[PDB]
Amino acid sequence: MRAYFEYRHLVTFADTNLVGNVYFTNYLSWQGACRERFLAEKAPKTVARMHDDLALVTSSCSCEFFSELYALDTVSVRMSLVGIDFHQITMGFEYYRVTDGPARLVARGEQTVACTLRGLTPVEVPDELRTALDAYAP
Amino acid sequence: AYFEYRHLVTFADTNLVGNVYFTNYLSWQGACRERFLAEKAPKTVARMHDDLALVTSSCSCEFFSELYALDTVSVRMSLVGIDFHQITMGFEYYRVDGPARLVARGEQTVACTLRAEDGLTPVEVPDELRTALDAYAP
Amino acid sequence: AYFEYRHLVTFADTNLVGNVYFTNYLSWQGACRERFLAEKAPKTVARMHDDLALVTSSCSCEFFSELYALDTVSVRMSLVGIDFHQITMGFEYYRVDGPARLVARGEQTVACTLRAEDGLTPVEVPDELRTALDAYAPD
Amino acid sequence: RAYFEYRHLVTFADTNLVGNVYFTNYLSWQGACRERFLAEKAPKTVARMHDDLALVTSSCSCEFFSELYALDTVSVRMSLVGIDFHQITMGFEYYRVTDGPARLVARGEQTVACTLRDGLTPVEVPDELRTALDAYAP
Ligand SMILES: [Cl-]
């Protein structure tokens, strides 16, 4: 089983603010880009269910910032499976600065998504998505 | 004769250079036009959850002087014209204290279509939306 | 005892699911904390162009209910505590017709620092910013 | 080739309640593309920006032909339209390349001015930036 799923992003000017570093919200956006790239590549049919009856909703998210990223930096975001609780999936995120080559931890994050049906009713994690997560056991 | 959208420029609007990143000016067009829809055309809005689709045909903006963090910008929207199913809106951006100072100028066009299974077929501007826009006609 | 930031939810705030994308909740914290600086701490703001830097050390948000397009959200900020150089802010998100409805709840921590020689350097919260946050502290 | 390419996977944050990509994102991609270009083709020019050189966006625009959707892959193709002493005009073509075949979905354009950083003074486009731009001339 693979330990992680890697997402890479080149930091551009819009990611930064007047202070000179990457604005904190962008770290959360990278969690979104990462988790949804995983869905596109590892569980395509699950996405089709979302336009129907399936509803994947973020229940919580968080991020801790150790060091700063700058413009034209390359960030490597590694997502790992923390655990599954019936309908809830918890992910872990590790942010690395890999601009000069060697990776250096600049931030650590975590978020939880819930699988529901269109009010909203908790439903067990779809088998396709469930099989995809099996290769990323902690 | 204009519909105003006021916005306090915060750090996220800025970049490492110090000024407001140019894409935010287009974002303010969206916030303005949709705040307009919420206040002036509720029936048109409620209809969008059904068979009505508003698609942006084109957009543009011209920049004269820069906005900075914690500045207050007055986005002022006016009706440029209506061509059957297409609505063209004009935007003027004002740095507002003292007298208001023009810092930018923009424009975008929105088309009204019927969301059908075959595709998006152009429908004339809804009566509610047209009369509401005429209040800001030249 | 809270500082309010009101926001009209527009189409850009939503995604294909129909609700507000979760990152926007964090954006509203930034918009709220910086509106606070502009209105309650001008001396601290101008000092940031000098040798003062406010770095975000952590943030989080819990989501109870969904916000939709053209909803009005009341982002209410209060002081949780201060530890030397770090400020922890609490956030409550309310859906505002009728009575206000809590839809989310978050928190973030900001550290004050010097732009000195070896980069960032921990600094006790400026007196201007310290007394400004007191008005929104549980007291 | 005849264009500098910026490839982007459309994720959920790019979309709105309708299901298509919100129009402002097309402009965001112009910024990401131009700044990725600068990082790879004009590193010394980038270095000048932290000193006295300032590239100011004077205008931008985009024309939308057909919609992009979630998990689409878009190919943003930037070419040189013209250089007027200190002003650079870039052209952008947006292609859906999801399933493989490329289809034009949008076309944009923006102009940047090379100035010096009181007051702004026009300065001729740096030779490094100029010769790098010539590779994508019409
Ligand atoms: Cl569009």
Side-chain angles (χ1 to χ4, degrees), chain A residues 2-44 46-117 119-138, chain B residues 1-96 98-113 115-116 118-123 125-138, chain C residues 1-42 44-96 98-114 116 119 121-123 125-126 129 131-138, chain D residues 1-43 45-116 119-138:
Chain A
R2 280 192 234 132
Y4 60 88
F5 179 85
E6 183 179 281
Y7 161 83
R8 287 208 169 187
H9 174 74
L10 175 67
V11 175
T12 53
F13 290 173
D15 294 335
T16 72
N17 69 116
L18 83 169
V19 179
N21 65 322
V22 170
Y23 200 69
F24 76 100
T25 61
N26 294 290
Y27 289 79
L28 287 314
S29 290
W30 296 337
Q31 288 185 9
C34 181
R35 72 179 187 186
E36 284 145 29
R37 188 182 195 96
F38 180 87
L39 278 176
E41 297 182 7
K42 305 302 179 179
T46 299
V47 181
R49 291 191 57 192
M50 307 191 193
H51 305 174
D52 183 28
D53 66 327
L54 183 61
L56 263 58
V57 176
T58 309
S59 60
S60 69
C61 75
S62 64
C63 192
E64 191 178 13
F65 312 95
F66 307 138
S67 180
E68 301 170 17
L69 291 172
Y70 307 109
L72 306 190
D73 264 349
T74 304
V75 54
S76 182
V77 183
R78 295 196 167 180
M79 179 182 55
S80 62
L81 182 62
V82 172
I84 304 179
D85 188 23
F86 182 67
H87 73 292
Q88 289 194 306
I89 306 175
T90 303
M91 295 147 280
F93 297 89
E94 287 177 326
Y95 303 77
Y96 297 95
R97 184 180 180 272
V98 295
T99 304
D100 296 319
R104 201 167 305 265
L105 189 65
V106 298
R108 205 193 308 273
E110 176 180 315
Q111 76 165 229
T112 302
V113 292
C115 303
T116 62
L117 295 182
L120 261 51
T121 300
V123 61
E124 203 174 36
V125 177
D127 277 15
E128 186 202 24
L129 179 57
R130 186 54 200 263
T131 304
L133 295 175
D134 277 17
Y136 297 83
Chain B
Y2 59 87
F3 179 83
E4 185 189 43
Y5 162 76
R6 272 175 158 265
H7 177 74
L8 176 66
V9 173
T10 53
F11 291 172
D13 298 329
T14 65
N15 68 112
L16 77 166
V17 175
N19 69 323
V20 176
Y21 199 75
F22 78 102
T23 58
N24 290 285
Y25 289 81
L26 281 311
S27 295
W28 297 339
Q29 286 184 12
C32 184
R33 69 175 190 185
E34 289 151 30
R35 172 173 148 88
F36 169 81
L37 284 170
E39 299 185 8
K40 263 57 184 177
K43 299 177 180 179
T44 305
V45 162
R47 187 179 170 180
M48 298 183 196
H49 303 96
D50 193 34
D51 60 337
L52 187 60
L54 294 206
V55 187
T56 307
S57 306
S58 66
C59 69
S60 62
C61 191
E62 192 175 10
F63 311 97
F64 303 132
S65 60
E66 297 165 344
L67 295 172
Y68 304 102
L70 305 189
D71 270 339
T72 302
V73 56
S74 179
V75 183
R76 305 177 179 177
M77 188 184 69
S78 60
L79 179 60
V80 173
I82 295 183
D83 181 32
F84 174 58
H85 75 289
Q86 287 194 144
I87 305 168
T88 303
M89 294 156 293
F91 296 87
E92 291 191 353
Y93 306 80
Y94 288 87
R95 178 198 183 102
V96 57
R101 180 191 182 187
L102 186 64
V103 295
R105 175 174 174 264
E107 176 180 297
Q108 75 165 233
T109 302
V110 166
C112 306
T113 64
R115 182 172 178 266
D118 190 274
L120 304 185
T121 48
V123 194
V125 180
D127 299 33
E128 178 196 52
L129 182 53
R130 172 179 290 271
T131 61
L133 285 166
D134 284 337
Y136 309 104
Chain C
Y2 63 88
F3 183 81
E4 186 187 18
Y5 164 73
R6 271 171 166 260
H7 178 75
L8 174 63
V9 175
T10 54
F11 294 167
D13 293 331
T14 65
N15 66 101
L16 81 175
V17 173
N19 63 329
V20 172
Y21 199 74
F22 76 103
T23 58
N24 290 287
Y25 288 80
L26 284 312
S27 295
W28 297 340
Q29 289 180 15
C32 186
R33 72 180 184 186
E34 285 147 29
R35 188 183 206 258
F36 175 81
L37 293 171
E39 293 186 3
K40 302 301 179 180
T44 307
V45 160
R47 192 190 177 187
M48 298 183 192
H49 300 159
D50 188 31
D51 61 332
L52 183 62
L54 267 63
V55 189
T56 311
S57 58
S58 66
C59 71
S60 63
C61 193
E62 192 175 10
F63 309 94
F64 302 134
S65 184
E66 292 175 332
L67 293 172
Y68 304 103
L70 304 188
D71 271 332
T72 307
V73 53
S74 177
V75 180
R76 307 179 182 182
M77 185 182 71
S78 63
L79 179 61
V80 176
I82 293 183
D83 186 27
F84 178 59
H85 73 290
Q86 275 168 324
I87 307 170
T88 301
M89 292 155 289
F91 296 91
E92 291 187 349
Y93 305 81
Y94 288 88
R95 179 164 172 168
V96 302
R101 172 176 179 175
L102 187 69
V103 298
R105 170 176 167 267
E107 172 180 312
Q108 75 165 238
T109 305
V110 160
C112 301
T113 181
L114 282 181
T121 303
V123 162
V125 183
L129 183 58
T131 181
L133 292 161
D134 281 341
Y136 303 104
Chain D
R1 286 190 243 82
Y3 58 87
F4 180 87
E5 186 187 27
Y6 165 73
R7 300 177 62 89
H8 175 70
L9 178 64
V10 174
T11 55
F12 291 173
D14 298 330
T15 69
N16 64 317
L17 74 160
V18 181
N20 61 327
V21 173
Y22 199 71
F23 77 102
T24 61
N25 294 284
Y26 287 83
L27 282 310
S28 292
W29 296 340
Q30 285 185 7
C33 185
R34 69 174 187 186
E35 287 147 26
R36 189 187 197 95
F37 169 81
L38 286 172
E40 299 182 9
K41 304 301 180 178
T45 298
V46 171
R48 289 196 59 182
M49 301 180 188
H50 302 301
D51 191 32
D52 65 329
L53 184 61
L55 270 65
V56 184
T57 305
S58 53
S59 73
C60 72
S61 63
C62 190
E63 192 175 355
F64 312 96
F65 306 140
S66 59
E67 300 174 350
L68 287 171
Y69 302 85
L71 304 192
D72 258 333
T73 299
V74 58
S75 179
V76 183
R77 305 180 179 182
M78 184 187 71
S79 61
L80 181 63
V81 174
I83 291 183
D84 192 19
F85 181 65
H86 75 284
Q87 293 193 299
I88 306 174
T89 305
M90 291 152 290
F92 299 87
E93 288 185 339
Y94 302 80
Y95 284 88
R96 163 185 284 103
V97 294
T98 301
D99 291 270
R103 176 166 172 266
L104 186 66
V105 300
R107 193 197 319 275
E109 177 178 314
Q110 76 167 228
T111 301
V112 294
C114 300
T115 62
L116 292 180
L120 287 186
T121 295
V123 59
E124 185 174 272
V125 176
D127 291 79
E128 179 203 27
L129 183 53
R130 173 176 294 271
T131 50
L133 283 169
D134 286 338
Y136 312 110

